[PDB]
Design a protein around this ligand. Structure first.
Ligand SMILES: C=CC(=O)Nc1cccc(-c2n[nH]c3cc(C)ccc23)c1
Length: 274
């Protein structure tokens, strides 16, 4: 048996209550037959790689404990069989990484605004309420949906060289750096450290190069440019805390501003492929 809490109700569910619609550790898009909800179902194989499995179990542990955060992807329930665990997860439309790829470039600042609000809050929530750092903030872990919701995913290592903070590469808030890097990536359409062929080469550029700020010739708001400059403060002791960042003007504006993220998302998903 499994118990799913989904759409406000509690169900006893059998693995047969899930209709597999295909693949997307191992993830299936599945329809729940008792309701018509379409969900993401992760499989943990008893016979799988033990490192993957413990990563999965860590993500699961954070996610279960984050039921009260609406900026973190929700788990509806689990099914344990003799050989497998199936994990029912909130299905999103796509990630920020896939949106960059489809768009062939810049996501508009107003969307990066809403995204920034949501991700900083998810991050803040798990620092405050659970003492958890994410350790792998990047665009593939930032998810969006048709309802204009933006959420954080994947806490299995609660980490990609590309988005590593300077103090993580060389130690005397590293998550805030990685956020900064993602935003520059997504606002300009280009991952800021160019033509790196290996992980260590990106690490080298992080440390030797100037922070990769938003380009002045793109007419980004000063708000946004300053938010990034604060996040991309290489000296971590000088880089701001979530509670400081929550009052940054960039966050405060897009928090109170009305942005139709859903129509933008629906329209961009329509007008593109892959
Ligand atoms: C950019 C890579 C990617 O993960 N894409 C993507 C595209 C569409 C939906 C999901 C997704 N929705 N819900 C999830 C829950 C987990 C644990 C992982 C991925 C998803 C993920």
């Amino acid at each position: 048996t499994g118990y799913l809490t989904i759409g406000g109700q509690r169900y006893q569910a059998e693995i047969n209550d899930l209709e597999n619609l295909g693949e997307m550790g191992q993830v299936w898009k599945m329809r729940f037959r008792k309701t018509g909800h379409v969900i993401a179902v992760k499989q943990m194989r008893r016979s799988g790689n033990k490192e993957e499995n413990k990563r999965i179990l860590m993500d699961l542990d954070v996610v279960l404990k984050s039921h009260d955060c609406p900026y973190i992807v929700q788990c509806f329930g689990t099914f344990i069989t003799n050989t497998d665990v199936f994990i029912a997860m909130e299905l999103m439309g796509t990630c920020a990484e896939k949106l960059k790829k489809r768009m062939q470039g810049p996501i508009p600042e107003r969307i990066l605004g809403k995204m920034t609000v949501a991700i900083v809050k998810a991050l803040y929530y798990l620092k405050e309420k659970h003492g958890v750092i994410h350790r792998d903030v990047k665009p593939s872990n930032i998810l969006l949906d048709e309802r204009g919701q933006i959420k954080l995913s994947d806490f299995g290592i609660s980490g990609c060289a590309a988005y590593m903070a300077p103090e993580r590469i060389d130690p005397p808030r590293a998550d805030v750096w990685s956020l900064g890097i993602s935003l520059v990536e997504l606002a300009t359409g280009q991952f800021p450290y160019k033509n790196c062929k290996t992980d260590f080469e990106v690490l080298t550029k992080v440390l030797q190069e100037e922070p990769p700020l938003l380009p002045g010739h793109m007419g980004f708001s000063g708000d946004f440019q300053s938010f990034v400059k604060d996040c991309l403060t290489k000296d971590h002791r000088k880089r701001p805390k979530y509670n400081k960042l929550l009052e940054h003007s960039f966050i405060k504006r897009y928090e109170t501003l009305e942005v139709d993220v859903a129509s933008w998302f629906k329209d961009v998903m329509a007008k593109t492929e892959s």
